[PDB]
Amino acid sequence: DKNDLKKKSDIDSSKLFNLTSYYTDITWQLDESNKISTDQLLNNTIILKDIDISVLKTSSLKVEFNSSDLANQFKGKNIDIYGLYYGNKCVGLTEEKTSCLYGGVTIYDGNQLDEERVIGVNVFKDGIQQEGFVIKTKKAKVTVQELDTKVRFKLENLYKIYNKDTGNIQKGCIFFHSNNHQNQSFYYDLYNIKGSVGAEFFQFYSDNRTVSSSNYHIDVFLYK
């Protein structure tokens, strides 16, 4: 239902400008393997050292989850991390330079595939099938954030989803469908972004929602 989707033209121009940066510059995508947390501030966070992010001049990473339960699942275990980080409003240890990411965490041990798993993305624009594409992961269990981000990056490149000076795409959504039909599909609205900075934009990923990479495919619906 197109009238349940938010409109690009209702997004403040400054916000579209900041979203464009997030989905144009690959440097915002953190992709770290076999790390381990060694500190914690709030009970729903874990802190990792020696994660060097050149563009923000930070050395530590705080991952924020929506529960103490999630943090407890991952604190002090070998983990992979994938997602979009932020530096502004990020609080770390007092004498450290820290960036922040919501969720994006998978157990490392036993989750590494012997080769890239390919996930199909079908794209429709005003109901007409467009050129499809794939995204890839090396993880058996993969965060939705990783899949969503890889798709959104490609959509920004091909369709200028978030560009402040384009207006030919006004609405859109991304659906995650189980191949075997055993899980209820779900979607995100591309133009339904919370707040005005990264600390707010990506907070919804704090659920650390995770799927089987073998069992999902993606459909994107775009509308003029």
Residue numbers in the entry: 27 to 250
Could you share sentences copied from the article?
Superantigens (SAgs) are the critical virulence factors of Staphylococcus aureus. SAgs can cross-bridge the major histocompatibility complex class II (MHC II) with T cell receptor (TCR) molecules to stimulate a massive proliferation of T cells (~20–30%) in a relatively nonspecific manner. The multiple X-ray structures of staphylococcal SAgs revealed that the protein is composed of an N-terminal oligonucleotide-binding (OB) fold and a C-terminal β-grasp domain. SEN belongs to the group III SAg as revealed by multiple amino acid sequence alignment.
The structure of SEN was solved by molecular replacement, and the final model was refined at 1.8 Å resolution (Rwork = 0.171, Rfree = 0.201). There is one monomer per asymmetric unit. Overall, SEN is a compact molecule and shows the classic two-domain architecture of SAg proteins. The N-terminal OB-fold domain (residues 52–137) consists of five-stranded β-barrel (β1, β2, β3, β4, β5a, and β5b) and two 310 helices (310 1 and 310 2). The C-terminal β-grasp domain of SEN consists of anti-paralleled β-strands (β6–β12) and α-helices (α4 and α5). Superposition of SEN and other SAg structures revealed that in the SEN structure, an asparagine (Asn44) is situated in a nearly identical position to that in the other SAgs. However, the aromatic pair is not present in the equivalent position in SEN. The corresponding amino acids in the position are Gly113 and Asn114. These amino acid variations might confer TRBV specificity to SEN. The ion-coordinating amino acids and their stabilizing amino acids are present in the structure of SEN.
